[PDB]
C-alpha cells in the first residue's frame, strides 16, 4: 500500500532534492 512511501520515499526524495 502506498501509505508508507508516499509519506517516506516521496517526502524523503523531495528532501533529498531540497537539502544542501
Curated annotation (Swiss-Prot):
Domains as described in the record: The transmembrane segment S4 functions as a voltage-sensor and is characterized by a series of positively charged amino acids at every third position. Channel opening and closing is effected by a conformation change that affects the position and orientation of the voltage-sensor paddle formed by S3 and S4 within the membrane. A transmembrane electric field that is positive inside would push the positively charged S4 segment outwards, thereby opening the pore, while a field that is negative inside would pull the S4 segment inwards and close the pore.
Residues on Cytoplasmic side: 2-16
Subunit organization: Homotetramer or heterotetramer of potassium channel proteins. Interacts with qvr/quiver/sleepless (via loop 2 of the three-fingered Ly-6 domain); this interaction may stabilize both components of the complex and may be required for targeting to or retention of Sh/shaker in neural cell projections.
Protein family: Belongs to the potassium channel family. A (Shaker) (TC 1.A.1.2) subfamily. Shaker sub-subfamily.
Reported tissue expression: Expressed in mushroom body (at protein level); this overlaps with expression of qvr/quiver/sleepless and nicotinic acetylcholine receptor (nAChRs) proteins also involved in sleep regulation. Expressed in the adult brain. Enriched in the mushroom body, anterior optic tubercle, superior protocerebrum, antennal nerve and visual projection neuron fibers projecting into the lobula plate of the optic lobe.
Record's protein name: Potassium voltage-gated channel protein Shaker
Region (S4-S5 linker): 3-16
Biological role: Voltage-gated potassium channel that mediates transmembrane potassium transport in excitable membranes. The channel alternates between opened and closed conformations in response to the voltage difference across the membrane. Forms rapidly inactivating tetrameric potassium-selective channels through which potassium ions pass in accordance with their electrochemical gradient and may contribute to A-type currents. Plays a role in the regulation of sleep need or efficiency. Plays a role in sexual behavior, where it is important for male sex discrimination.
Gene deletion effect: Hypersensitivity to reactive oxygen species generated by the redox-cycling agent paraquat. Reduced sleep. Flies sleep for one-third of the wild-type amount. They perform normally in a number of tasks, have preserved sleep homeostasis, but are not impaired by sleep deprivation. They also have a reduced lifespan. Males are able to discriminate between males and females during courtship but their courtship of females is reduced, suggesting that their perception and/or response to wild-type female pheromones is decreased.
Localization per record: Cell membrane; Membrane raft; Cell projection, Neuron projection; Perikaryon
Full-sequence range covered: 378 to 397 of 655
Amino acid at each position: 500500500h502506498s501509505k508508507g512511501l508516499q509519506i517516506l520515499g516521496r517526502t524523503l526524495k523531495a528532501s533529498m532534492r531540497e537539502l544542501g
